[model samples]
Target: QLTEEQIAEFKEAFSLFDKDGDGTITTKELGTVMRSLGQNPTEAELQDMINEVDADGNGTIDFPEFLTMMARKMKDTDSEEEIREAF
Candidate 1:
């Protein structure tokens, strides 16, 4: 839950990708957000990433699901750097 404050930060980042203020991040626009944060995720890779935490296989990520993924990646992956500039 980002301990609440961290959750606010995470929400800010999520909103950045939520773009149209749709309240969700769809796979279609994943690459754009990733690249803006300085990562290059391939289309196939995006699908796989979404597939990992995709509930109901909708391929659309909401806040809680994203926090879950972030929790996993933050533990050992150096990917947290991207999150630094997420918003």
Candidate 2:
């Protein structure tokens, strides 16, 4: 599980990346953010990422949903690694 502070950070970062204020993240938005983090995500890859992170099924990522995704993502890995991979 993420500390409240970490959740806050994820929410803050995701808010900037989410842009248009939509609750769900599309492939276009995700790829742009991923590229900035040195990740090259194709449309298909973006879909997979969204699938894992969009907990609310709204097609956009909300703060709580993002937190949930972070929790799941870090479950089997070092928290630092998960944080690095996410940002």
Candidate 3:
């Protein structure tokens, strides 16, 4: 189980990815997070990542959306594991 502290940290990370603070995350948001992490990916690269992950045409990613992407990065079956790896 995750503690409140972990959840808060994850929420902060998620908000950083949300960039525009529109309550949903877009490619730009992910771009911001990537850039913050020293990725400096091109706009095109970010778009490709977004399209690959954002299965729905919503254009903005919600908490679930963020989790989906995080899940892939985790390399594990559990979301908490993914969050731990991401942190």
Candidate 4:
């Protein structure tokens, strides 16, 4: 595991593409991929999830938001496949 690069760093590029100069992961795009992972998600349910990472208390996922979100989920065994697929 120590051999693994900070996959963390790589994920930042992902969050980058998902946003513009605004630079925040949009809910619709997030929902598009997230819902396909199996559990059909409601817009409300998706917002609840994003709320966890919207640390800036503004809108969807920003740097620290998307950054920490992916890293934390990747740490979870189930999320590995989802993260790999979505990206």
Candidate 5:
């Protein structure tokens, strides 16, 4: 259901998280990126966020996992859908 252009854009976002170009994003990298964005997230918070989309539970995020997470975030919720339907 994803377009090629969307995939490319998501890959670009993923690359920003995969700091060392290791093909996976570690907790350290996540923390670094979060801090860079001026947000201070705790270690437990970061872990929880990763666990939400980390299907493999490998303590790191792979490209596919990242894509799935992005999709979930981009999905419209029921309330949003209702609003859209109202218009």
Candidate 6:
């Protein structure tokens, strides 16, 4: 149910994280992205974050997985705990 602008924004973000242009996001890729954003999460924390949203159990996050995580975060934006959990 995302608007065109939202979808465009998501695609842009996804492309930035999909460093290899392979359409999937690895833990390292996300970790790097976070670091670029000034959030230096530990390796363990990054792994935990990946595991939380990697629905396909493929050790990576695809576009759908990313969207699902964002949707959950959006739904619970008031809950800092949920927001942290979603990403």
lDDT of 2 by residue, 1-87 (tens): 468787778777667678676754566788888998899988888878777777666666676777677666666567667788998
Per-residue accuracy of model 3 over 1-87 as CA lDDT, tens digit each: 445665566667778777666767777887888888999989898887777767686766776666656655554557667777898
Clashes (candidate 5): 0
What is candidate 3's local distance difference test score?
0.71
Clashes of 2: 6
| TM-score-best of 3 and 5 | 5
Root-mean-square deviation of Cα positions for candidate 3 versus the true structure, in angstroms = 5.6
**lDDT for each residue of candidate 5 in 11-85, tens digit (9 for 90 to 100):** 899999998999788888898899999988899988887777788999899989998887666665545787889
Candidate 4, TM-score vs. the true structure? 0.57
Q: Write the per-residue lDDT of candidate 1 for residues 1-87, one digit (tens) a residue.
A: 237876777788788877877877777667778888888999888788778866667778887777767666555354556666574
Q: For candidate 4, give the lDDT of residue 23.
A: 66
**What lDDT would candidate 4 get against the real structure?**
0.66
Question: Which residue pairs in candidate 6 have backbone atoms (N, alpha carbon, C) closer than 3 angstroms, thus clashing?
Answer: none
Model 4, residue 41: C-alpha shift (Å)? 0.7
- The candidate, 4 or 6, that scores higher on lDDT is 6
**Top candidate when judged by TM-score against the true structure:** 5
lDDT of candidate 3 at residue 5, scale 0 to 100? 67
Query: Residues 1-87, candidate 6, lDDT per residue (tens digit)?
Result: 556776677777888998998988888999999999999999888888988999998999988888778777756674777668787
Give lDDT: candidate 5, residue 66.
93
lDDT of each: 0.73, 0.73, 0.71, 0.66, 0.84, 0.84
RMSD of 5: 2.3
TM-score of each: 0.68, 0.65, 0.61, 0.57, 0.85, 0.77
RMSD for each of the candidates? 6.8, 5.6, 5.6, 7.3, 2.3, 5.4
Sort by TM-score, top down from the best: 5, 6, 1, 2, 3, 4
